Amino acid sequence: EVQLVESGGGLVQPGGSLRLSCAASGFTISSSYIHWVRQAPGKGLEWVASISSYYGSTSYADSVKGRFTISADTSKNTAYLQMNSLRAEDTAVYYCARSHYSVWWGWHSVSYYAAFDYWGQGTLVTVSSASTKGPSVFPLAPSSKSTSGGTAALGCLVKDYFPEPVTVSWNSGALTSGVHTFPAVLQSSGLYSLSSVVTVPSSSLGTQTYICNVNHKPSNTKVDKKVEPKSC
Amino acid sequence: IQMTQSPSSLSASVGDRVTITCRASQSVSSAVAWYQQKPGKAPKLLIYSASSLYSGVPSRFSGSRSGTDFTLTISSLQPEDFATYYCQQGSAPFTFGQGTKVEIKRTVAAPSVFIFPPSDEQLKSGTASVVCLLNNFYPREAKVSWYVDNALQSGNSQESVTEQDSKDSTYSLSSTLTLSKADYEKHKVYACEVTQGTTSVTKSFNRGEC
Ligand SMILES: [Cl-]
Ligand SMILES: [Cl-]
Ligand SMILES: [Cl-]
Ligand SMILES: [Cl-]
Ligand SMILES: [Cl-]
Ligand code: NA
């Protein structure tokens, strides 16, 4: 029943500002310390900030002091992390988390140890001056003449988009067996590209319909593409 | 007050005993936590207070302390256990360890290999993307070579590898070769060669085909 849902990530020009939200459900935020923890792409975990609305106490990773402001609204059972003067070093997936040790005693001079038991889903904060570009989506058509493992393969190539992320889905979520969506790769152009593939019975090539559904929430664009054998 | 984690990466087989160690620079009481992170997902708490198993966490996980050294132990590795594991100290400033990538070791697995010509829609753009798919193989390292009219291609392809499958511990890999529409249109035979051990497979197509 306990859930932590984030919001407010996305692209931001260097030096600009973003506000991240953390909506808690299934527990009161005053009974807890709420923390933010970020992860730069490919690097490890770094604690950023913490708040307890009950004590009115906030604490900041030195790496952000003064530029970040972490706050909470009890009426809304929600925590916020407002970020000002963002730098490239600030690009990361930001997570909110609840410390497992509740503010149990109502006495004030009590330091609590931190272990994070409930986490948000993570939102990406990207600090670049590049423009948002939506993806082009191209079929990866099978051949009945190129069968590998008794089965056939088909795909969607999702090319030249920024920023990440892109969600791919097949036949409106009705096909999940055999699907591999690849991690995105960053082209020399500075644009991203990935592809998503699915293995299917060799017989079903002409008989079945395969539509890939590509979602690029950063550009508010969703593309559906039917995949067919070339058939000239 | 820093947290040195060790080793940085390890491979071990299903059921092997895995031990990750964390080194605190000063004394952090017993307030140390352990997390399992699957790629791009939020970390999951495993151990808090250095020794206490978080509810829901399988019994195969345990934590222990010996002085300034906290260790996480997986008594018999499971294929769904590939992840990156982090130690964290529980007192301020809550430093995290460096991470320990746990990759799983299994039998050699042959890739199923497919090749895909570029689409006509992409051709109206002036660029051709040829994609070579290696499906459900192990180990991760495989030699993929591109040929265009039997000329080896270099410098114009990009690889992407999936994460390990959570039941069979295999990978899948994509190779994307990018060319000008003019370049693609002046050559006939496209081929992707996969080498693994003492077996090479080459998959191909001719531009004029159906
Ligand atoms: Cl508690
Ligand atoms: Cl498109
Ligand atoms: Cl090893
Ligand atoms: Cl940290
Ligand atoms: Cl052909
Ligand atoms: Na992406």
User: How far is Cα A185 from Cα A190, in angstroms, rounded to an integer?
Assistant: 10
One domain for residues A122 and A67:
yes
DSSP tag of A75:
G
* Interatomic CA distance for residues A206 and A221, integer angstroms: 29
Are the beta carbons of A68 and A80 closer than 8 angstroms? no
Backbone angles phi, psi at B53, to 5 degrees: -80, 120
- Contact present, A74 and A53 (Cβ < 8 Å): yes
Min Cα–Cα distance to chain A from B113, Å: 6
DSSP track, A120-178: ---EEEEE--PPPBPPEEEEE---TT--SSSEEEEEEEEEEEBSS--EEEETTTT--TT
Query: Which has the closest alpha carbon to B64: B76, B55, B52?
Result: B52
Contact list, A183 vs chain B (CB under 8 Å): 39, 160-163
- Residues A44, B130: Cα–Cα separation, whole Å: 34
Domain assignment of residue A232, yes or no: no
On whether both A107 and A32 belong to a single domain, the answer is yes
SS3 B26: coil
B133 has a chain A CB within 8 A of its CB: yes
Do A11 and A123 sit in the same domain of this protein? yes
Interface residue of B6, B85, B100, B119 to substitute, partner A, most A CBs within 10 Å: B119
Question: Is residue A222 domain-shared with residue A189, that is, in the same domain?
Answer: yes
Map B97-139 to HEC letters.
CCCEEEEEECCCECCEEEEECCCHHHHCCCEEEEEEEEEEEEC
Last residue of a domain, one of A110, A127, A144: A127
Looking at A84, A108, A127, which one is the last position of a domain? A127
Residues of A in contact with B161 (CB under 8 A): 182-183
User: Closest Cα of chain B to A148: distance in Å?
Assistant: 6
Q: How many Cα atoms occupy the beta-carbon half-sphere of B177 within 13 Å?
A: 23
Is residue A144 within 8 A of residue B117, CB to CB? The reply is no
Do strands A18-25 and A46-52 pair parallel, antiparallel, or not at all (unpaired)? unpaired
The closest alpha carbon to B56, from B76, B83, B84, B36, belongs to B36
Residue A41 is assigned to a structural domain of this protein: yes
Domain at B3-105: CATH code: 2.60.40.10
A180: burial class by Cβ within 10 Å (0-12, 13-18, 19+)?
buried
Strand partners, A223: A214
Total domains in chain A come to: 2
Q: At which residue do the structure tokens 């890999």 appear?
A: B173
Of A141, A142, A183, the CB nearest to B160: A183
Contact A197 B135 (CB under 8 A): yes
Q: Is B147 on the interface with A (CB under 8 A)?
A: no
Amino acid type, A114: A
Query: What is the C-alpha to C-alpha distance for residues B65 and B87, in angstroms, rounded to an integer?
Result: 12
CB–CB of B160 and A145 under 8 A? Answer: no
HSE (side-chain half, CA atoms, 13 Å) at B17: 3
| Residue at A18 is within a domain | yes
Last residue of a domain, one of A127, A149, A179: A127
Q: Evaluate whether A92 touches A64 at the Cβ level (below 8 Å).
A: no
* B117 vs A: CB within 8 A: yes
Q: Which residues pair with A224 in a beta bridge?
A: A213
Which ligand minimizes its atom distance to the CA of B189? 5
CB–CB of B135 and A100 under 8 A?
no
Q: Which two tokens stand for residue B90?
A: 């529980």
Closest-CA residue to A78 (of A36, A118, A117, A25): A25
- Which chain B residue has the Cα nearest residue A227? B119
Check if the beta carbon of residue B92 is closer than 8 Å to that of residue A52.
Answer: no
d(C-alpha A218, C-alpha A178), whole Å: 27
Test the A interface: residue of B125, B133, B158, B199 with most A CBs within 10 Å:
B133
Q: Method of determination?
A: X-ray
Q: Which of B114, B132, B164 to mutate to test the interface with A (most CBs of A within 10 A)?
A: B114
Radius of gyration for the alpha carbons in chain A, expressed in angstroms and rounded: 22
Q: Please give the angle made by the CA atoms of A50, A54 and A56, to the nearest 5 degrees.
A: 60
How many whole angstroms from its chain centre is CA A175? Answer: 22
In a domain, A157, yes or no: yes
Q: Among partner residues A116, A148, A180, which is closest to B172 by beta-carbon distance? A: A180
Ligand approaching nearest to the C-alpha of B206: 5
Q: Quick one: tokens of A177?
A: 């067996």
In a domain, A101, yes or no: yes
In chain B, the N- to C-terminal Cα span, in Å, equals 64
- Beta bridge partners, B20, equal B72
A191 found inside a domain: yes
Please state whether the peptide bond connecting residue B7 to the residue before it is cis, i.e. omega within 30 degrees of 0. yes
b/e B185-201 (16+ beta carbons within 10 angstroms → b):
eeeeebbbbbebeeeee
List the shell of residues around ion ligand 1, using CB closer than 5 Å.
Answer: A 102
Same domain (yes/no): A7, A91 = yes
Q: Indicate the resolution in Å.
A: 2.7
CATH of domain B112-206: 2.60.40.10
Alpha-carbon distance values, A86 to A13, A35, A38, A68, A93 (Å): 8, 19, 14, 9, 14
- Asked if A193 lies within 8 A of B88 by C-beta distance, the reply is no
Measured distance CA(A90)–CA(A130) in Å, rounded? 16
* Nearest chain B Cα distance for residue A227, angstroms: 10
d(CA A205, CA A203): 6
Residues A79 and A191 placed together within one structural domain of the fold: no
CATH of the domain at A39: 2.60.40.10
Query: Reduced to 3 states, what is the DSSP secondary structure of residue A107?
Result: coil
Identify residue A98 by its one-letter amino acid code.
R
Of A142, A148, A194, the CB nearest to B160: A194
Note whether A155 and A189 are same-domain residues: yes
In the block, residue with structure tokens 């390292």: B141
H or E element: which one contains B184? helix B181-185
Nearest to B17 by CA among B65, B77, B67, B66: B77
First to last CA, chain A: 53
With contact defined as beta carbons under 8 Å apart, do B72 and B61 qualify?
A: yes
Do residue A11 and residue A108 come from a single domain?
yes
Note down the domain range covering A29. 3-127
* Residues forming a β-bridge with A133: A162
- Give the phi and the psi of residue A76 in degrees, each rounded to 5: -95, 0
Residue B199: in which H helix or E strand, if any?
Answer: strand B199-206
Q: Which residues are A66's β-sheet partners? A: none
Could you tell me the residue ranges of all domains in chain B? Answer: 3-105, 112-206
CA distance B72 to A221: 44
Record the tokens describing residue B110, joined without a space.
Answer: 């042959």
For chains A and B, CB pairs below 8 A equal 152
Q: Has residue A25 been placed in a domain?
A: yes
Residues A166 and A65 in one domain: no
